[PDB]
Amino acid sequence: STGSATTTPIDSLDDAYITPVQIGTPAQTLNLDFDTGSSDLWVFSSETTASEVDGQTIYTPSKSTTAKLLSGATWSISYGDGSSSSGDVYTDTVSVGGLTVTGQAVESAKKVSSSFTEDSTIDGLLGLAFSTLNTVSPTQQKTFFDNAKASLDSPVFTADLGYHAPGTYNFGFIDTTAYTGSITYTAVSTKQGFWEWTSTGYAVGSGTFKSTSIDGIADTGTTLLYLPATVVSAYWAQVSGAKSSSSVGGYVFPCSATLPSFTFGVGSARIVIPGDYIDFGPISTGSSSCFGGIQSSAGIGINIFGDVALKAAFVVFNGATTPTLGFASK
């Protein structure tokens, strides 16, 4: 089997991407944030505290003839941005882009933190990291990909995120029309539950490439590119007036600037992030200070190849017995 679904930016900045997902019988379609940095499929629901729902579409298990309470199971997750959610668990039929999994754990939110309530466009998350990170207790549950894997034509999914445009998540096949050149594959460590890999270096603009190992995670659920402070300082030093602002929470730059590109290494290959992808717009409405899309990972404890980096590439998440990641230009 295969599936193919379009993923759409939630706003003009590509702060996140939503993909329609069919849950239950008859189908209830919710727009979920596909997150290769976590491993829970959770949704706003008929059980979510009413004051914490503000425009989201909810899953109502009592209206699904295939829903079943997973008796005794609870979940609770906290994300790197400080947001969180928790609740109980149903199993139900879940389909993405024509690919169907029966018996998928659908984690129904009883509580969500304010940033989830405040984002009316995201109806929940669909985790695509390794199932070892799934938070369901006392019986840990499998991700949608893990459940689908054996049925797929090939045990892979691909992320093709757009810059200020829709893109695609494919399951079970690699669309050879969706990228240019060849795909370079690189080793993955699953020891922390992430799609963790080692970039071979970077360049700023037209500058020379610096060969240096940068361990980090491929995380579709993180907006920005978070790298070591040395690398990030070298980037922003090429932008007149750019500075790290403790009050804003990272590097800002004059909105009048033209940003340089940023290149990262994948083995001997190179992925180029155009400068425009690094512009996250005014820090507050009408400000001439703009927020940077490359930020320091110092204090986060891990480097994160988030959407800013991933959207510059066609990315293969290879879930073969020994997982690997593939990157191609596009």
> What are the residues whose beta carbons fall under 8 Å from the beta carbon of 186, sequence distance 6 or more?
197, 198, 266, 267, 324, 325, 326, 327
Least Cα distance to 197 among 294, 266, 269, 293 occurs for 266
In 3D space, the residue among 101, 113, 138 whose CA is nearest the CA of residue 22 turns out to be 101
Report the catalytic residues: 35, 199
- Scanning 118-203, the segments in alpha helix (DSSP H) are 144-148
The rounded distance, in Å, linking the Cα atoms of 290 and 281 is: 5
Q: What angle do CA 51, 56, 62 make, to 5 degrees?
A: 85
Question: How many residues would you count in the chain?
Answer: 330
Q: Give the Cα separation of 285 and 201 in Å (integer).
A: 35
At 114, list the tokens: 């304010």
At residue 261, the 3 state secondary structure works out as coil
Domains of the chain: 5-174 (2.40.70.10), 175-330 (2.40.70.10)
First to last CA, the chain: 25
* Residues whose CB is less than 8 angstroms from the CB of residue 324 and which lie 6 or more positions away in sequence, other chains included: 185, 186, 187, 188, 316, 318
267: left (phi over 0), alpha (psi -120 to 50) or beta: left
Q: What is the DSSP string of 180-226?
A: SS-PEEEE-B-TTSS-EEEEEEEEETTSPPEEEEEEEEE-TT--SEE
Other Cβ atoms closer than 10 A to 223: 20
Angle, alpha carbons 181-184-188 (nearest 5°): 155
Structure tokens of 244? Answer: 């790290």
Give which of 186, 153, 207 is closest to 265, Cα–Cα. Answer: 186
| Alpha helix (H) residue ranges in 67-190 | 114-117, 144-148
DSSP H helices, 226-290, are 229-236
Strand-pairing partners, residue 325, are 186, 317
Handedness of CA 223, 174, 269, 194 (dihedral sign): positive
Tokens of 314: 């066609």
- Bridge partner residues of 13 (DSSP): none
Q: How was this structure determined?
A: X-ray
Dist CA 87 CA 110 (whole Å)? 5
What stretch of H or E contains 141?
none
| Coil, strand or helix at 232 | helix
